[PDB]
Write an enzyme that holds these catalytic residues in place. Structure first.
Site, PDB file in Angstrom:
ATOM      1  N   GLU C  54      18.510  48.420  23.304  1.00 23.87           N
ATOM      2  CA  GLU C  54      18.072  49.064  24.514  1.00 23.87           C
ATOM      3  C   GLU C  54      16.572  48.396  25.008  1.00 23.87           C
ATOM      4  O   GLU C  54      16.296  48.042  26.002  1.00 23.87           O
ATOM      5  CB  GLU C  54      17.896  50.399  24.547  1.00 23.87           C
ATOM      6  CG  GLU C  54      19.096  51.540  25.154  1.00 23.87           C
ATOM      7  CD  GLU C  54      19.618  50.841  26.465  1.00 23.87           C
ATOM      8  OE1 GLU C  54      20.591  50.102  26.493  1.00 23.87           O
ATOM      9  OE2 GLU C  54      19.095  51.072  27.246  1.00 23.87           O
ATOM     10  N   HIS C  58      20.455  44.123  24.894  1.00 27.09           N
ATOM     11  CA  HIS C  58      21.357  43.237  24.271  1.00 27.09           C
ATOM     12  C   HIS C  58      22.247  44.020  23.328  1.00 27.09           C
ATOM     13  O   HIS C  58      21.622  44.566  22.423  1.00 27.09           O
ATOM     14  CB  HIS C  58      20.836  41.949  23.718  1.00 27.09           C
ATOM     15  CG  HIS C  58      21.803  40.859  23.396  1.00 27.09           C
ATOM     16  ND1 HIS C  58      22.505  40.170  24.479  1.00 27.09           N
ATOM     17  CD2 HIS C  58      22.077  40.270  22.119  1.00 27.09           C
ATOM     18  CE1 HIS C  58      22.939  39.384  23.562  1.00 27.09           C
ATOM     19  NE2 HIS C  58      23.030  39.285  22.234  1.00 27.09           N
ATOM     20  N   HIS C  59      23.247  44.389  23.671  1.00 30.70           N
ATOM     21  CA  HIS C  59      24.207  45.151  22.729  1.00 30.70           C
ATOM     22  C   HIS C  59      25.026  44.699  21.770  1.00 30.70           C
ATOM     23  O   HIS C  59      25.727  43.571  22.354  1.00 30.70           O
ATOM     24  CB  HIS C  59      24.718  46.149  23.677  1.00 30.70           C
ATOM     25  CG  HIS C  59      23.839  46.660  24.648  1.00 30.70           C
ATOM     26  ND1 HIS C  59      23.149  46.259  25.721  1.00 30.70           N
ATOM     27  CD2 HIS C  59      23.123  48.053  24.665  1.00 30.70           C
ATOM     28  CE1 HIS C  59      22.464  47.004  26.329  1.00 30.70           C
ATOM     29  NE2 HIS C  59      22.186  48.232  25.610  1.00 30.70           N
ATOM     30  N   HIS C  76      26.903  37.756  26.873  1.00 29.76           N
ATOM     31  CA  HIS C  76      27.631  37.659  28.278  1.00 29.76           C
ATOM     32  C   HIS C  76      27.147  36.942  29.399  1.00 29.76           C
ATOM     33  O   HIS C  76      27.961  36.304  30.239  1.00 29.76           O
ATOM     34  CB  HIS C  76      28.198  39.070  28.766  1.00 29.76           C
ATOM     35  N   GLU C  77      25.752  36.958  29.494  1.00 33.25           N
ATOM     36  CA  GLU C  77      25.405  36.194  30.588  1.00 33.25           C
ATOM     37  C   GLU C  77      25.650  34.512  30.454  1.00 33.25           C
ATOM     38  O   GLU C  77      25.946  34.066  31.668  1.00 33.25           O
ATOM     39  CB  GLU C  77      23.839  36.438  30.578  1.00 33.25           C
ATOM     40  CG  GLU C  77      23.046  35.861  31.853  1.00 33.25           C
ATOM     41  CD  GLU C  77      21.514  36.265  31.764  1.00 33.25           C
ATOM     42  OE1 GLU C  77      21.336  37.545  31.632  1.00 33.25           O
ATOM     43  OE2 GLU C  77      20.902  35.369  32.156  1.00 33.25           O
ATOM     44  N   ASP C  85      21.200  36.543  20.633  1.00 36.69           N
ATOM     45  CA  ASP C  85      22.024  36.850  19.549  1.00 36.69           C
ATOM     46  C   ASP C  85      21.373  36.453  18.112  1.00 36.69           C
ATOM     47  O   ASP C  85      21.550  37.377  17.136  1.00 36.69           O
ATOM     48  CB  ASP C  85      23.407  36.044  19.523  1.00 36.69           C
ATOM     49  CG  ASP C  85      24.233  36.275  20.730  1.00 36.69           C
ATOM     50  OD1 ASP C  85      24.439  37.778  21.165  1.00 36.69           O
ATOM     51  OD2 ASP C  85      24.675  35.465  21.622  1.00 36.69           O
TER      52      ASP C  85
END
Lengths: 99, 100, 100, 98
Positions: C54, C58-59, C76-77, C85
């Site tokens: 949070e 970035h999950h 994802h972006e 990552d």
């Protein structure tokens, strides 16, 4: 731990199936996907379930990615569905509706 | 750059929070509110959601928990007093509390 | 924001591959399975990673069953591996250390 | 049941040795924990929270960013019990990891 008898399954599963839980094909277990608005809610949901998992010493097989949480439940001890799964599923539903 | 709330913004932002249970701390420029849940499971689930937001915003609560009770005090260290950060976190805390 | 180049991949993945992270075959992402003594440690680990997720927005994609946690990371972006990552995986390793 | 003078002498020393002290004016033990940041502090709390539910014994704690202050006592017997010694021992195990 004892696997649910056909009589127990007809009595305990319908209410769970009515809100999204469904039995798996090649395995005696129930599964349901949960979809929250964001991760804050999804993880808050997981935190509450985690606490209960430790209290009941029965843990979920679950996957999460941001706002999605997928849960599979089954009892290792008796290799199949038991009251533990029914109990945890019911608890999970209580937590989910608040999220 | 955090800056304490002026008299004007206090009269415009605080009443809203008082209307939902928040009080100004006696002897200190901060606000507080005691939350009561049915059990610890709920209380800690509440804390977990607030903790995530605290890290997202880098603004943390001064809180005390005993089983089903969670007492929260909010203030901004950077400016030794209430700032928009406290108002914002209080608003978020309210959202989470209402859901339970 | 941007997918890792060939150079970035060679310069950023070593410390990670050395500790068990591997790139997937059908997609641009890295994966690693973590094993803890119990669920208490496994979820404590997830709680610390959740807070950082949070904070960084970035999950992870993760699966947990008692003491095991399988993690997959990708951005994802940019539809692939990015520094976000590398950074989260590095943080994940630090947390895993504190969890026995 | 509340710990006897003998039980306290047999169970508290090890905890007192790592920073736990009895409160004045109340039969309970307390210790201030300090971590590098909130991420570690809350991670610590989460592990303790899980155990609290497993044992059904909960801590009285205060947290502000990287600091966690814990007070332990048993309401049922209005004082220290083996439940407090056990939870405190578990808390110590988690703290040495952070």
């Amino acid at each position: 731990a004892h696997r649910l008898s056909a009589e127990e399954r007809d009595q305990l599963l319908p209410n769970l199936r009515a809100v999204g839980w469904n039995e798996l094909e090649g395995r005696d277990a129930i599964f349901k996907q949960f979809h929250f608005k964001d991760f804050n809610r999804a993880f808050g949901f997981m935190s509450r379930v985690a606490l209960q998992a430790e209290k009941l010493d029965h843990h979920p097989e679950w996957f999460n990615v941001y706002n999605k949480v997928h849960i599979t439940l089954s009892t290792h001890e008796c290799a199949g569905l038991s009251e533990r799964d029914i109990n945890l599923a019911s608890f999970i539903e209580q937590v989910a509706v608040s999220m």
